[PDB]
Design a protein around this ligand. Structure first.
Ligand SMILES: [Ca+2]
Ligand SMILES: [Ca+2]
Lengths: 428, 428
């Protein structure tokens, strides 16, 4: 009832307020209006009973639930408007402590999903966004139009530095553009970061000299802050242009710090989203992957995985790619789960596609997700009957057929490596 | 079927392997053994089809599901043993990328909850643990035996530095030991960190000089890394002994970095767990708060909130307090959801109790949770009919009755401030 003060369905936020859309399942006995005012109060200025010193900014900073949509299943969409003065400039941690913070554990709530957040220009521009973006990564690699290709070794762990370096050579030499560490590679004793990086950067130099094509390494710098700082400088000192960071397990502050060092050292960042599915799977509680991707783009990844691609989940993968690549995102008519979002001064991000992609499947992914993607094509490459070099060539020929508008069956007659890819795995 | 290679119910891990216990709900059509081998493979060395360079460490690094317990509801407990060479020394991010990483989003899994992880001594000792612990915080405050008391201002936001400083004075002057920022206080423009800290540290100096009692400020340094570093030094330069960090919204690497600066500057750390309920609420998917508390103690908080306290949730709050305070945690007989854990070389943590605590309720919380706690007693203090000074005195008298073994009704006859606390709120 003190919480009615935070609800106002006659309010109209301007374009200059932060807007959150929540999917709210009130606990038993709690009305949606009650739950919504508690969410608005807890994620902004709290409450007071008696005032022993005036807070001159309380009514100014207060958030308002101004709009309700009954989903007919026990949950509601609630829009909450937030004054921008609630948030510290350029700080993802402070944003998350408000809108992604205690509200998830309140007793009045049986489920709370944060679906999307609209950031106004004055707040959005306090964040750097990607250092390089799609166009800067294409320029690093010299790849004008086609999708870029990446491969993680198999197995993901178990190689000494010497062994890992020979594995990378075969991958790059046949046409893959980026060799990628897996998410749990860091600097374990069996393969320390520096000794591993030397062996891969020697493999890159050979492959560039023989192919004529630039190559890069998505080196995993996930680490406590001081160790990450050293590893980012070692990557830079070896002439590599990319770092990878597990931004949910190292954390948002680590990602924003890596983004500052990327500025200093002229690097691109691959953001790995490991841990996201602990809280992005349940449609009734947690954070949508859509919003995690939007925050990753603000914080400054240049690449981010959007999940796997007609049905509801494919529709949402398509919304993920739109929110990370577009300069002006607009929800389709009647879609209440996302908000309109201009991205003035924030470069687009490369969506990463992955999930058992073989040469046969690549044209359809490119037609559906567009050419501005990174495809991770591990199984298709390392599992080719003629070895990984031929495997990377098959993927490149498959991509070539898609760029040239040629049927795969037709292309796979003057192209040996691809021919056996279609033989072995077909159109999966 | 390649995944049978990671299951072995005849295996007996030594005391020197990391052990995880997962609650696994296989997807439709997937057997538990299949799901369990996929979890073990994905959280360790992955798989391979053909080998183009030998991984000399694959079979050595491989994790094994060695034990199954059917919960009779569609989910199983699965124990997985992990060689310690999988993990980078002292790195919570690398640990999380393995055991808290991609396994949550695998298609074979309909739910995956990480219930607990046993850390062997050789791995556990690569982490610093608390800088101060219970005993070091008691020595900072000069509080030998009783619970320590903390208060967050109301409202949690809206005060200028000048206004916030007068609010803190009244809190400390009447007997509260620690004034605490709320989780979303950082350095917003209406109340910047430095100007706020000056006003509170002047309030502390007055209160210590008038009461004779040491006081402290849990200053929220949650921020991008460079801003946090400056704020931790400003806290230290002003002679304050505490920092607070939202360790899930700033992230694990930020917490471990704050722990190194606390070493340098001789500070204690209050860890705020905002965001945890996005993934610790669902018993079928996510991470138990028990394990989050264990990782917080390893990473080095000195205080951590354990959630609110006979039934199942109270039992678990009691297990939370045991895992953060004990030197040798042992599950009760037949409890399969937790593992035995020695804490050699890791100081105990102060559990924090909170949740509408009034003077009437305090003795029961102290009898149930023990004297080695921090109680957050905001409403009881700021809402006292005679003002917050009297409110802090009522809480202290209530604590005094509990230490002295005196009934509250009896104590509240020669103690005015408390008398009205029992009048107003009673025994809630
Ligand atoms: Ca990825
Ligand atoms: Ca707390």
């Amino acid at each position: 009832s003190i919480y009615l003060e935070f609800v106002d369905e006659s309010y109209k936020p301007g374009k200059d307020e932060v807007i959150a859309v929540f999917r709210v399942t009130p606990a038993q006995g709690i009305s949606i209006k009650d739950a919504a005012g508690r969410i608005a109060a807890e994620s902004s200025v709290g409450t007071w009973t008696t005032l022993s010193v005036k807070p001159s900014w309380f009514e100014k900073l207060k958030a308002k639930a101004y709009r309700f949509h009954d989903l007919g299943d026990g949950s509601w969409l609630v829009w909450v408007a937030y004054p921008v003065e609630l948030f510290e400039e350029g700080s993802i941690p402070n944003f998350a402590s408000s809108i992604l913070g205690n509200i998830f554990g309140m007793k009045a709530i049986a489920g709370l999903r944060v679906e999307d957040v609209y950031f106004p220009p004055s707040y959005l521009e306090t964040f750097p966004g990607p250092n390089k973006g799609i166009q800067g990564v294409r320029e690093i690699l010299g790849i004008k139009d086609r999708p870029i290709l990446a491969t993680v070794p198999k197995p993901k762990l178990g190689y000494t530095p010497e062994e890992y370096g020979r594995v990378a050579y075969e991958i790059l030499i046949g046409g893959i553009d980026l060799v990628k560490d897996d998410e749990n590679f860091a600097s374990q004793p069996f393969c320390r970061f520096e000794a591993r990086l030397k062996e891969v950067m020697k493999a890159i130099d050979r492959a560039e000299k023989e192919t004529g094509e630039r190559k890069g390494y998505l080196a995993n710098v996930t680490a406590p802050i001081r160790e990450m700082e050293k590893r980012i400088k070692l990557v830079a000192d070896y002439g590599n242009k990319f770092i990878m960071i597990d931004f949910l397990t190292a954390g948002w502050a680590a990602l924003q710090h890596a983004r500052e060092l990327a500025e200093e050292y002229d690097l691109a960042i691959h953001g790995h989203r490991a841990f996201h599915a602990a809280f992005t799977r349940n449609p009734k509680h947690g954070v949508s992957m859509f919003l995690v991707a939007k925050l990753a783009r603000m914080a400054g990844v240049d690449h981010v995985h959007v999940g796997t691609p007609m049905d509801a989940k494919t529709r949402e993968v398509l919304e993920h790619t739109r929110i990370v690549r577009e300069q002006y995102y607009r929800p389709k008519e009647g879609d209440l789960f996302h908000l309109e979002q201009p991205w003035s001064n924030i470069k687009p991000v490369f969506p990463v596609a992955s999930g058992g992609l073989h040469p046969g499947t690549l044209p359809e992914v490119i037609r559906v997700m567009g050419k501005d993607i990174i495809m991770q094509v591990g199984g298709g490459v390392l599992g080719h009957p003629d070895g990984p070099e031929a495997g990377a060539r098959a993927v490149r020929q498959a991509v070539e057929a898609a760029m040239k508008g040629i049927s795969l069956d037709e292309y796979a007659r003057e192209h040996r490596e691809l021919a056996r890819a279609l033989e072995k795995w077909g159109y999966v």
